[PDB]
Amino acid sequence: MESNNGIILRVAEANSTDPGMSRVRLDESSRRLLDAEIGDVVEIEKVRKTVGRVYRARPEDENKGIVRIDSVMRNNCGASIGDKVKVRKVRTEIAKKVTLAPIIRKDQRLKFGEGIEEYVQRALIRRPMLEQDNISVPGLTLAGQTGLLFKVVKTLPSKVPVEIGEETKIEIREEPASEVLEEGG
Structure with missing residues (x-):
């Protein structure tokens, strides 16, 4: 603290x-x-x-x-x-490395590859970031699913509000909203 x-x-x-x-x-x-x-x-x-x-x-x-x-x-x-x-x-400040976890299906929005990590920076660039924060998607979804939002889990700054830039590095997790329902606890 x-x-x-x-x-x-x-x-x-x-x-x-x-x-x-x-x-x-x-x-x-x-x-x-x-x-x-x-x-x-x-x-x-x-x-x-x-x-x-x-x-x-x-x-x-x-x-x-x-x-x-x-x-x-x-x-x-x-x-x-x-x-x-x-x-x-x-x-x-300018976040240098941020990790996030878009909640969708493997075939929803994260089906690009090659520069997909930069694609997140391209869309999120110049934006305030805070690990564990969340974001919204342009009204997109599928069947009766829930979540469909980006959930940030880690940041490089001092856990304080930072603004992303094209030089910021990003990390995407390979476990989106798949079998994830807080079953633990």
């Missing part, structure tokens, strides 16, 4: 545009209570670890203990509206 500074507030969310899964709207006190300035990098942790950026709340008075995020950011950690998550301020 090299550094741990954030606040405990409740995840917010309402009908709106699909984007906003990478921006946090908060108030001066929620962001200034620690040090977060405009456009600093913020990390979130309700059920899992999450990353995001700081934004100015429209209502500079209600956002003194609530964070408005998209359903995807809520899906990234696994919390419900009004839950309790801890958001800690951090900074961004």
